[PDB]
Design a protein around this nucleic acid. Sequence first.
RNA 1: UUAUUGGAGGUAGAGCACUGUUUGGACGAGGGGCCGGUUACCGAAUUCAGACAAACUCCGAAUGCCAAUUAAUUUAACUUGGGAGUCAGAACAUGGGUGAUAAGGUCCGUGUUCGAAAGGGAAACAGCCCAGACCACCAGCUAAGGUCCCAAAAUAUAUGUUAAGUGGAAAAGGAUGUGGCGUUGCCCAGACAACGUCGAGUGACACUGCGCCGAAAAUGUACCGGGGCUAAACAUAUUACCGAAGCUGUGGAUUGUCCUUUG
RNA 2: CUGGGGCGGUCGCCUCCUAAAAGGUAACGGAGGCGCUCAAAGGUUCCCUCAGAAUGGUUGGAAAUCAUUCAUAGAGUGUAA
RNA 3: UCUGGUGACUAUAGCAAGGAGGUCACACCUGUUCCCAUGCCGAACACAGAAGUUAAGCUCCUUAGCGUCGAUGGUAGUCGAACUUACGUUCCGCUAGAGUAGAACGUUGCCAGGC
Lengths: 94, 137, 79, 58
Amino acid sequence: ASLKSIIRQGKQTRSDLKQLRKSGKVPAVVYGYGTKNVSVKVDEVEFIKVIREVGRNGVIELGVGSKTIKVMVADYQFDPLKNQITHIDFLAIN
Amino acid sequence: MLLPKRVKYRRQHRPKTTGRSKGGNYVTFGEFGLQATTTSWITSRQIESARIAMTRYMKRGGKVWIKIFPHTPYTKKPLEVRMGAGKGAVEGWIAVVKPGRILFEVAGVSEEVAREALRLASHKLPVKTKFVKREEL
Amino acid sequence: VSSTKNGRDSESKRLGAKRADGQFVTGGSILYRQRGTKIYPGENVGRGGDDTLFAKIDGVVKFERKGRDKKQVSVYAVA
Amino acid sequence: AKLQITLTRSVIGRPETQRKTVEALGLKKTNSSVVVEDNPAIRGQINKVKHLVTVEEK
RNA sequence: UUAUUGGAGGUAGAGCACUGUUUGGACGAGGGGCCGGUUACCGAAUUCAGACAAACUCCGAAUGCCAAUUAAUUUAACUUGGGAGUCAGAACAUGGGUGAUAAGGUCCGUGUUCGAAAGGGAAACAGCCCAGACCACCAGCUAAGGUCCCAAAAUAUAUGUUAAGUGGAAAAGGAUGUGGCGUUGCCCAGACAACGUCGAGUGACACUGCGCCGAAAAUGUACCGGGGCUAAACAUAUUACCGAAGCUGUGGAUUGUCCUUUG
RNA sequence: CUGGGGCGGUCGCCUCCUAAAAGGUAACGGAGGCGCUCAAAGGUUCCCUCAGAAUGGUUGGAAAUCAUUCAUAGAGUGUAA
RNA sequence: UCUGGUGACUAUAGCAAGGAGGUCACACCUGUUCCCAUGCCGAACACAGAAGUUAAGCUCCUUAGCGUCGAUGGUAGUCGAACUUACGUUCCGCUAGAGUAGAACGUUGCCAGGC
Ligand SMILES: [Mg+2]
Ligand SMILES: [Mg+2]
Ligand SMILES: [Mg+2]
Ligand SMILES: [Mg+2]
Ligand SMILES: [Mg+2]
Ligand SMILES: [Mg+2]
Ligand SMILES: [Mg+2]
Ligand SMILES: [Mg+2]
Ligand SMILES: [Mg+2]
Ligand SMILES: [Mg+2]
Ligand SMILES: [Mg+2]
Ligand SMILES: [Mg+2]
Ligand SMILES: [Mg+2]
Ligand SMILES: [Mg+2]
Ligand SMILES: [Mg+2]
Ligand SMILES: [Mg+2]
Ligand SMILES: [Mg+2]
Ligand SMILES: [Mg+2]
Ligand SMILES: [Mg+2]
Ligand SMILES: [Mg+2]
Ligand SMILES: [Mg+2]
Ligand SMILES: [Mg+2]
Ligand SMILES: [Mg+2]
Ligand SMILES: [Mg+2]
Ligand SMILES: [Mg+2]
Ligand SMILES: [Mg+2]
Ligand SMILES: [Mg+2]
Ligand SMILES: [Mg+2]
Ligand SMILES: [Mg+2]
Ligand SMILES: [Mg+2]
């Protein structure tokens, strides 16, 4: 429940999104209680291992910059061909 | 032998073929399934041959679903005719698949039986296929 | 021997809008040409016998919504 | 400030929508230049035809 | 022509709220097994989930269209009159009908070129890529494409793949062919083979790059243009050069616009 | 006219689709209608608001008709869309 | 501010549910003598009334249950460009529908009365 994130900068183009997915990274956003919209980056391999040990519906304490937020998972877009996760939405709860 | 009982227009334009699957690309009714990898038409004789070869291998065990129905009629003009004196009579009924679409779903059987039953069906369709599970996570 | 029984069509009628939003018009000019009432008349706009919308006075023309999903035309005075 | 624009690719084989923009800039033959000042309406015409011209900051 | 504003309209895509089509599962009412009813079966209704549409739409782009601004850059536009020729069109790319998701087919829309256009490249080759010839010159810079010899310019630098002359004409399928990247099994307690020995690695799955078989036609090698090539192939980066009637340089001709010394 | 010509079929007008979100746009491309009617089915002034479904109720052809609750027009609108 | 009359605004304004409110306004309510009225019915409409009542309409609170509104981020599609003939790829602009967080149990002009 200790996953790490990296804040994306402004205005990702088309190229640097697919260049980000040819690494092991996946784009993401966080929103909800007490926060603002922050768009982030998560490793794919690390994200699967956290889900497979806390379940589909569990609490993740991930860190954005300095602070850490208790975060649940809202939805995710999946590519059924070539079977990789392509977007993940995060929801803060408190 | 699948065909609709009544259609408003018997003579129709042919469907658009390029692109990706609009929807219906996750297994929902069963445990295992067969998804497509290239693009083709399926002409309602192929899914009769494929459903029979599906069924006799499983010895009437678990259930089998078909996610494809042939909705669109296509025509053909008779033998040795000049071009253009109207549009010919109907010939058969097709359904269009694009890469992603699930074709059959099976359930109620072990996994290695499901791989072999779907492999026998896949040699009767004109499209490259692939064996898939029920996705989670 | 084969033949067909479809060759008929009507002549097309040049429907649609005839003046643009923000344009100055003269006091009798046709604004919109339609079957039925896709657009209602508003201020200083008459509605003809064959549902043609036309201007009463001369001025500038404004298209504008009416309710949730209704549209109207008005003509306002000063130019 | 000022910009120098140079017609580097020729204009034949191109659509007439792009030929009329090149004339509006004031370019006549290939490798011919013009000096104008920077302006958001001038950047729009450079944006349209940017695969045919070369801009330097004068 | 562009920037900024405003507006008309229902395509692409999506979707099932109407019209039609359709797959499973439930719910119960009816007939309906029976001995009137059970249960099975039937059709209809209502719901849960999931799919289809040129003549379906609760939604809805990009672009194109109409206009207005003491906006900015450009140079056309319109009216009247005199004089014509044209009404067999073609290929390419793209959006669609027809046809067999056949034709160098046929019919519409949108662009380019040919027609009526030489020059360079594509071996040769109206329609493909570059590019629009006033005339001299034994002067220079470049485009597309190229730099072993034919034939002008790198047997150039650096990293890797391929062993099939692949390159230098094709599929479903099949396969211990070889590289790269991941997940996960059994590990020196002795596996994994072969028969206590053997003493270190051993399997599966998944995604991928190049290649192999599948591959039979008629005058003579016989689709690399030829020689020839294991790079002179392929992929990725860098620096140089060749290369046109394109652009510069020098001189000259004709016409026009300015200034005007009609120079 | 004609994917040679003949045989066959068609020749004027209206509405949809093709038609590529202005308008326009072809083919022996796909679907249908017209060659009228109305003395009120016209004008004006006042009133009214449906089909359908559900539930009850002699005739109940199941539904004719009656009451009740909902019901965006699904009704109806002389005649195709 | 409270009540009423009357206008403006894409239901964020609606629908449902729960609770309070009244002889000042409003309404149920009393009656068919008169104007007027019902394909029959003083139900409706019209008139004459003020005994009764806050039960209902109405108004004020409470709720996000249905409907409505709705970003950010990602994706589909696409103008332009560059490779190519593959049911294509790459770059750059624009940017959906669905879904999620959330909004929301109206806002406001004029007059009269009651404060
Ligand atoms: Mg779906
Ligand atoms: Mg579509
Ligand atoms: Mg179509
Ligand atoms: Mg449509
Ligand atoms: Mg003619
Ligand atoms: Mg002609
Ligand atoms: Mg041709
Ligand atoms: Mg063709
Ligand atoms: Mg054309
Ligand atoms: Mg000629
Ligand atoms: Mg020309
Ligand atoms: Mg030439
Ligand atoms: Mg040559
Ligand atoms: Mg050739
Ligand atoms: Mg020639
Ligand atoms: Mg040089
Ligand atoms: Mg070059
Ligand atoms: Mg030679
Ligand atoms: Mg040489
Ligand atoms: Mg070969
Ligand atoms: Mg091959
Ligand atoms: Mg072979
Ligand atoms: Mg031979
Ligand atoms: Mg040879
Ligand atoms: Mg020259
Ligand atoms: Mg258009
Ligand atoms: Mg149009
Ligand atoms: Mg007829
Ligand atoms: Mg009474
Ligand atoms: Mg949206």
